[PDB]
């Protein structure tokens, strides 16, 4: 029941991040939520001798209609002393990505029973803002561990084991992983039988309470990585062959032995674009050979946990989106395609925002760390609306893409 | 005596790794020194300060100015080096309330808490760094020592420590007086109700006594200044507000401390006066970094400052904000990258107005400008009213749909409706997605020579039409564009164009409708006249027909 000493890193102050404007209903809802968390001792008012701040805002989580309190702990997390004291942090389970199914369970609800180190609470400062800057902002600090802080799982780490040693020993088939305030639970089981072993853990997390009710169902074994394919036609126009040679030329940056000499030859001259060109046998050969090369994966594409993960997203239209994760250009560690039906249809930014969430989930599962996104959106449009659609309790980093790539077609 | 509730103390430290101030008291004239002991003697008589002994080693200078137009001396501690050693405070200073966001309340009182500042105690452990010396006459005695026991004038923490103190005291009165509103900005207390002025002036007394119970002194008699106030550059009336009148300075030659007190005095006007523009006066600045340099006024500006002496002539007032009714925002394209907006709830009655200027980009188009203004008005509305206005926008719904469905970036604007008041924002051209059957195919190419800067640009086509034009003082990027321009210039209403210029695709795929490059502008005007254009890209140096038998033509 005693706190665990936490420091920042030397030469770093606490976070002093501005709170951005919130709508009236989101302020109204944070006020009630923070008024219960005050009564429950989870937070306490603070005074102006506290210089620190961390933005806060309000959401609804999936298939629930109750405002939830989200705290963007990104900047504190950069400044927080990574916890390599006893253990060097929970290693990533390479087995979690190889599982027929993975369910994500919100265990943040447990964090609020652990006290936080009184020296450190000054650093979790946040502010409910007022409309129009009329009344000053309502300031609180955290007493318990904060949902969204990277220290909260690190510190619950040991204590989360003594809840899960019964279960891990009971089902040594399962892999169970924790990132932030989420529990990732993977089994090779049948899906009906995988759901049962989950509800097994919902009740086993109620027993510990005495001394968090729904299921998000990934399938890392109902997805893989994505080859570059070439069209298959009986007749080709000049345009068809120009797009081909373009795509092969781009793919040659990735796969070395790709050749376009005999297809290019057909593009000699200046025929009309919609004109059918017969393929030379040299060119049919060169195309078949390229198709070969593109069935192998890339050689020497190794993850390196000392470098950053980058995520690029392209808008393909009609609710379809593509993405690539990598560390070094052309050495993709995963690629993918996200698709519509999901409050999409008429709001690109909700699509993009959901797409950023799925990729970051897939990214936790594969490496236990979030990538830096390159978004195909104006900074100003994105910063205005992304919180209106966010549902997850973590937040990745992002920058913004302002030049339309040619590559959209190639990934198409 | 009825006892005063004591005001709880805010702990204050120095900054990590800092001593306290150790600065000499300046030599003061003789009469100045007489005024300070006079001031400090009554202050010590009031519990505000207190003499200190020969231990306290910290010292802050103190001056005395004459309160001009008065024989009363004004004292003044100069806390600069103390502030430099004081910790940082939480700062609620971020935001000055905007008049348009105030609700219309029937009765309104403002009270200046210029005093109670000195009633708010100071952290005992921090009193001893507020020490100062009243130097003596002829330096023939020690200076009279002193430290502060309440929040000291012009100190780092005083406005923050006062504000929090004040809010604590105000919570329970508000909570149990929900039939009134109380805002809290500056050292000023805003109070307001829809109660009739008898029960309004009632609760104004009640709060006066509630403030007594802690030690806070309120202007009992009628405050000399009563609504309407001219406040912080505005004029706040019981049914309306406007900007405090501000005429524009006149100059035969405008320096830079002039055009900045003119684009500043004009950015202020535009928040209620609709249609203010400031472009041909802001170009004369960002291309200049000298606070006394002179620039004559451009030909386009001296008709513009005659427009800003033409809006600022009749009174325009804003109204107050009524939560029951919908918020509307309306935008108008004002030309040359400027946008003007009116936020209102009822026709003709503006809450507030404003402008938007394009970002200093290289190419641009009307829709991304309209989109960017919506996002500004949206953040600005969230700030002032706590909600997003419904938009009425000079763009057809069909145009917006073509744009965002085909735009390579994700984009979005909130709920809006078409207002048919020109100039309408439109799509000037649209590229085909497939090649055009029956359209002539122009394989284009360009190249220059980096040293001689010379180059060529042209096309060859499928019907044998060719052209190569020589060019002087040009670049690879310039000739790649020129090649495309030539092909548009000599083609029919429908045209397929092959280039290898990744530079060109990138410009055209951003779909500008206006450009800094006048070459790009002409391509744009050529595109506007065509019926269909398919722009295809092929990679270079593959001797890709068009771009071989014209790569071998333009580098020859
Ligand atoms: N008694 C006058 C006193 N206050 C005002 O003039 C005044 C006018 C309007 C407001 C106001 C409006 C909205 C909000 Cl939300 C608010 F918190 C305050 N304040 C002083 N102003 C400048 C002084 C320098 O000597 S003194």
Curated annotation (Swiss-Prot), chain B:
Instruction: Cite the Reverse transcriptase domain residue spans from the record.
Output: 46-236
Annotated localization: Virion
Tell me which residues are marked as the site Essential for RT p66/p51 heterodimerization: 403, 416
State what changing residue 439 to I does: Replication slightly delayed
Q: Where is this region: RT 'primer grip'?
A: 229-237
Outcome of swapping residue 186 to I: 54% loss of polymerase activity according to PubMed:9533880; increases polymerase activity according to PubMed:9657675. No loss of RNase H activity
Q: What is the effect of changing residue 531 to Q?
A: In strain: Isolate PV22
Q: What is the effect of changing residue 266 to S?
A: 17% loss of polymerase activity. 30% loss of RNase H activity
- Per the annotation, the residue ranges of the short sequence motif Tryptophan repeat motif are 400-416
What's the effect of swapping residue 443 to A? Virions contain primarily p51 RT
Q: Where is this site: Cleavage?
A: 442-443
Domain statement: RT is structured in five subdomains: finger, palm, thumb, connection and RNase H. Within the palm subdomain, the 'primer grip' region is thought to be involved in the positioning of the primer terminus for accommodating the incoming nucleotide. The RNase H domain stabilizes the association of RT with primer-template.
Record's protein name: Reverse transcriptase/ribonuclease H
Organism in which the protein naturally occurs: Human immunodeficiency virus type 1 group M subtype B (isolate BH10) (HIV-1)
Q: What is the lineage of its organism?
A: Viruses, Riboviria, Pararnavirae, Artverviricota, Revtraviricetes
Stretch of the intact protein here = 600 to 1153 of 1447
């Amino acid at each position: 029941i005693e706190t665990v000493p936490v420091k920042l890193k030397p030469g770093m102050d606490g976070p002093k991040v501005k709170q951005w404007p919130l709508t009236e209903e989101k302020i109204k809802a944070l006020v009630e939520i923070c008024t219960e968390m005050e009564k429950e001792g989870k937070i306490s008012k603070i005074g102006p001798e506290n210089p620190y701040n961390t933005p806060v805002f309000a959401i609804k989580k999936k298939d629930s209609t109750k405002w939830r309190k989200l705290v963007d702990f990104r900047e504190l997390n950069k400044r927080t002393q990574d916890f390599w004291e006893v253990q060097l942090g929970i290693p990533h389970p390479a087995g979690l990505k190889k599982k027929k199914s993975v369910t994500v369970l919100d265990v943040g609800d447990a964090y609020f029973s652990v006290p936080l180190d009184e020296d450190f609470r000054k650093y979790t400062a946040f502010t409910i803002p007022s409309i129009n800057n009329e009344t000053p902002g309502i300031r609180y600090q955290y007493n318990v561990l904060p949902q969204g802080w990277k220290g909260s799982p690190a510190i619950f780490q040991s204590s989360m084991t003594k809840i899960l040693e019964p279960f891990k020993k009971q089902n040594p088939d399962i892999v169970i992983y924790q990132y932030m305030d989420d529990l990732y639970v993977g089994s090779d089981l049948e899906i009906g039988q995988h759901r049962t072993k989950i509800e097994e853990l919902r009740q086993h997390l109620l027993r510990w309470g005495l001394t968090l009710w729904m299921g998000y169902e990934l399938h890392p074994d109902k997805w893989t990585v994505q080859p570059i394919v070439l069209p298959e036609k009986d007749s080709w126009t000049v345009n068809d062959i120009q797009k081909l040679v373009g795509k092969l030329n781009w793919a040659s940056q990735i796969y070395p032995g790709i050749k376009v000499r005999q297809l290019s030859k057909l593009l000699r001259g200046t025929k009309a674009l919609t004109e059918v060109i017969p393929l030379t046998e040299e060119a049919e050969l060169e195309l078949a050979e390229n198709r070969e090369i593109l069935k192998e994966p890339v050689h020497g594409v190794y993850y390196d946990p000392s470098k950053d993960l980058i995520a690029e997203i392209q808008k393909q239209g009609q609710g379809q989106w593509t993405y690539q994760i990598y560390q070094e250009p052309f050495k993709n560690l995963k690629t993918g395609k996200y698709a519509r039906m999901r409050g999409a249809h008429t709001n690109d930014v909700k699509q993009l925002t959901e797409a950023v969430q799925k990729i970051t989930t897939e990214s936790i599962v594969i490496w236990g760390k979030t990538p830096k996104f390159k978004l195909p959106i104006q900074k100003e449009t994105w910063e205005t609306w992304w919180t209106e659609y966010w549902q997850a309790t973590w937040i990745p980093e992002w920058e913004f893409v302002n030049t339309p790539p040619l590559v959209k077609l190639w990934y198409q | 005596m009825v006892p005063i509730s004591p005001i709880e103390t805010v702990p204050v430290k120095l900054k990590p790794g800092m001593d306290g101030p150790k600065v000499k008291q300046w030599p003061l004239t003789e009469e100045k020194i007489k005024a300070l002991v006079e001031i400090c003697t009554e202050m010590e008589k009031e519990g505000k300060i207190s003499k200190i002994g020969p231990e306290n080693p910290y010292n802050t200078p103190v001056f005395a100015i004459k309160k001009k137009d008065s024989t009363k001396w004004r004292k003044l501690v100069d806390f600069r080096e103390l502030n430099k050693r004081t910790q940082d405070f939480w700062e609620v200073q971020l935001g000055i309330p905007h008049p348009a966001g105030l609700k219309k309340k029937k009765s309104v009182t403002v009270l200046d808490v210029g005093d109670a500042y000195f009633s708010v105690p100071l952290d005992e452990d921090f009193r001893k760094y507020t020490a100062f010396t009243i130097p003596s006459i002829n330096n023939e005695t020690p200076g009279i020592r002193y430290q502060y026991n309440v929040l000291p004038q012009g100190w780092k923490g005083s406005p923050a420590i006062f504000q929090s103190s004040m809010t604590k005291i105000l919570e329970p009165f508000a909570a149990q007086n929900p039939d009134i509103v109380i805002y809290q900005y500056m050292d000023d207390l805003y109070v307001g109700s829809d109660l009739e002025i008898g029960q309004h002036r009632t609760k104004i007394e009640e709060l006066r006594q509630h403030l007594l119970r802690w030690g806070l002194t309120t202007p009992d008699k009628k405050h000399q200044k009563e609504p309407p106030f001219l406040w912080m550059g505005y004029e706040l009336h019981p049914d309306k507000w406007t900007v405090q009148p501000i005429v524009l300075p006149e100059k035969d030659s405008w320096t830079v401390n002039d055009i900045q007190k003119l684009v500043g005095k004009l950015n202020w006007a535009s928040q209620i006066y609709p249609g203010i523009k400031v472009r041909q006066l802001s170009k004369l600045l960002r291309g200049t970094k000298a606070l006394t340099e002179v620039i004559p006024l451009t030909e386009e500006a001296e008709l513009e400052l005659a427009e800003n002496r033409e809006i600022l002539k009749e009174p325009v007032h804003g109204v107050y904000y009524d939560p029951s009714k919908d918020l509307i925002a309306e935008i108008q394209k004002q030309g040359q990258g400027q946008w003007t907006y009116q936020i209102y709830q009822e026709p003709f009655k503006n809450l507030k107005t404003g402008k938007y200027a394009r970002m200093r980009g290289a190419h641009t188009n009307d829709v991304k400008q309209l989109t960017e203004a919506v996002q500004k008005i949206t953040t600005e509305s969230i700030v002032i009213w706590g909600k997003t206005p419904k938009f009425k926008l000079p763009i057809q719904k069909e145009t917006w749909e073509t744009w965002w469905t085909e735009y390579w970036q994700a984009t979005w604007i909130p709920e809006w409706e078409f207002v048919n008041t020109p100039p309408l924002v439109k799509l000037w051209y649209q590229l085909e997605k497939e090649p055009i059957v029956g359209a002539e195919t122009f394989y284009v190419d360009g190249a220059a020579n980096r040293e001689t800067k010379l180059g060529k640009a042209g096309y060859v086509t499928n019907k044998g039409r060719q052209k190569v034009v020589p060019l002087t003082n040009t670049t690879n990027q310039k000739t790649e564009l020129q090649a495309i321009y030539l092909a548009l210039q000599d083609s029919g209403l429908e045209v397929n164009i092959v280039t290898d210029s990744q530079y060109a695709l990138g410009i055209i795929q951003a779909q500008p409708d206006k450009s800094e490059s006048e070459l790009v502008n002409q391509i744009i005007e050529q595109l506007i006249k065509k019926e269909k254009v398919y722009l295809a890209w092929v990679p270079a140096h593959k001797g890709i027909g068009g771009n071989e038998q014209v790569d071998k033509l333009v580098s020859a």
